[PDB]
Amino acid sequence: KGMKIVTSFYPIYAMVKEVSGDLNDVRMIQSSSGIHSFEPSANDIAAIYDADVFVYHSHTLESWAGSLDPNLKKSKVKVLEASEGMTLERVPGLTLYDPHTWLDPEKAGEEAQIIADKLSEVDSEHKETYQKNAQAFIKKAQELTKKFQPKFEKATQKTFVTQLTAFSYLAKRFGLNQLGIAGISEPSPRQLTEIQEFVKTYKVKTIFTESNASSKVAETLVKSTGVGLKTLNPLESDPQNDKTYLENLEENMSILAEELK
Ligand SMILES: [Zn+2]
Ligand SMILES: [Zn+2]
Ligand SMILES: [Zn+2]
Ligand SMILES: [Zn+2]
Ligand SMILES: [Zn+2]
Ligand SMILES: [Zn+2]
Ligand SMILES: [Zn+2]
Ligand SMILES: [Zn+2]
Ligand SMILES: [Zn+2]
Ligand SMILES: [Zn+2]
Ligand SMILES: [Zn+2]
Ligand SMILES: [Zn+2]
């Protein structure tokens, strides 16, 4: 029992719980369905306003976080932006940035260090603990990287196609390249030829889709490309299981390393 913390979505909950080292109680706004386009409910906003601290990933994703001001209401709350001053990257083809930072383990460690630095500024008593826990995270996240950097170096092919384009940072970590499919749901006889040419050019043996994807899109994908489907998890929603955040990242990069080697 300590500071009452409430987080936006899963990865923030996980990072705050790993940095806090169970020093205090942490909760998460239960974001039904999508977190990428979601404005909070009455209970959620009222409960974050009655909490010791509420932390969110970035203003480029949780736009509704900047609409808060405890000074003009119940002001028990400290609003922390876990990714303040991080180096995000514009989206190709165009100001909009790609907020999917947390999928890169080293960038996840960067965000965890920021979280620890901002949480020790609010909880002096236990700063030595925060800085400690985070510094262990950085180590693990580092080890993980060194575990996969070589097998992705030996990787024959370094490109993967996905229905969910949320892995730019994970790809840049290991020198890979992600691409997207240009057919969504009933494709034309011309779009079919184009997709065949695309699958040929890039020698695509498998198309990746969001975890718990819809069946209607998977069916048309398999029918249009002619290849099987594997699953990648953006961790936008807590996959209820007993695995640690870095283990959930290792899962994604294991799937990738198997497909590419
Ligand atoms: Zn208290
Ligand atoms: Zn989604
Ligand atoms: Zn997303
Ligand atoms: Zn910001
Ligand atoms: Zn950075
Ligand atoms: Zn001290
Ligand atoms: Zn404390
Ligand atoms: Zn490195
Ligand atoms: Zn399903
Ligand atoms: Zn869990
Ligand atoms: Zn491991
Ligand atoms: Zn899993």
Residue numbers in the entry: 30 to 123, 136 to 226, 230 to 305
Quote the study on this structure.
Streptococcus pneumoniae scavenges essential zinc ions from the host during colonization and infection. This is achieved by the ATP-binding cassette transporter, AdcCB, and two solute-binding proteins (SBPs), AdcA and AdcAII. AdcAII belongs to the cluster A-I subgroup of SBPs, consisting of a conserved structural fold of two (β/α)4 domains connected by a rigid α-helix, with the metal-binding site located at the interface between the N- and C-terminal lobes (Loisel et al., 2008; Yukl, 2017).
In this study, we investigated the Zn(II)-binding mechanism of AdcAII by mutating each of the four Zn(II)-coordinating residues in the SBP. Structural analyses of Zn(II)-bound AdcAII variants revealed that specific regions within the protein underwent conformational changes via direct coupling to each of the metal-binding residues. The binding site mutations impacted protein conformation and interaction with Zn(II) to differing extents. Intriguingly, the phenotypic growth impact of the mutant adcAII alleles was, in general, independent of affinity, suggesting that the Zn(II)-bound conformation of the SBP is crucial for efficacious metal uptake.
